[PDB]
Amino acid sequence: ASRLYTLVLVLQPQRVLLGMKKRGFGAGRWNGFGGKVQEGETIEDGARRELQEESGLTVDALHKVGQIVFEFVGEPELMDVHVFCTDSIQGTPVESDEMRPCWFQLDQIPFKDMWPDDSYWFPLLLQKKKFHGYFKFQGQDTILDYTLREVDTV
Numbered sequence: 001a002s003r004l005y006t007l008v009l010v011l012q013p014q015r016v017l018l019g020m021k022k023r024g025f026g027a028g029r030w031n032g033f034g035g036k037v038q039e040g041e042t043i044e045d046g047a048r049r050e051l052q053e054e055s056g057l058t059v060d061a062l063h064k065v066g067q068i069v070f071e072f073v074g075e076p077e078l079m080d081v082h083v084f085c086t087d088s089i090q091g092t093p094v095e096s097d098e099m100r101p102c103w104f105q106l107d108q109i110p111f112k113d114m115w116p117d118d119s120y121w122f123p124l125l126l127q128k129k130k131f132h133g134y135f136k137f138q139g140q141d142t143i144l145d146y147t148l149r150e151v152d153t154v
């Protein structure tokens with residue numbers, strides 16, 4: 001049994017949009033935009049909703065680029081994160097109560113202040129390769145095990 005989450009990366013030729021999480025789970029780390037998928041909405045509906053809630057942005061089309069399953073020691077529910085990419089967005093990103101957005105050059109991605117797993121799978125994101133990932137965490141900082149592979153269908 002697993003819970004559905006979304007993660008949206010606005011990735012452009014020279015820059016990627018990241019948000020500084022201001023509260024809740026993962027506060028103090030840069031990440032893409034997303035959250036829990038609700039009842040009554042598709043996964044992509046949920047990605048669009050969290051994107052707009054956290055940045056004010058809307059998008060024409062979201063592309064599926066990955067899936068990452070996380071296990072936390074002692075926690076019965078697996079986290080099933082569906083990762084999406086878009087290039088062109090509608091609007092200018094602005095700060096919300098949950099996220100402070102900034103553009104990062106692709107050689108200045110702040111991996112030190114991101115979830116540790118990002119260092120493993122962001123390269124595949126940057127190569128526009130579709131991937132499946134699995135990470136086993138002890139707490140929030142320690143990766144105990146992981147698998148990562150390119151796939152044909154996300």
Ligand SMILES: Nc1nc(NC2CC2)cc(N2CCN(C3COC3)CC2)n1
Nearest residue numbers: 005006007031034035070081115117118
């Ligand atoms: N880049 C990245 N890494 C993660 N690592 C696992 C935690 C160890 C999780 C993650 N997402 C799952 C959580 N979700 C939170 C913001 O509200 C829920 C954002 C996207 N995104």
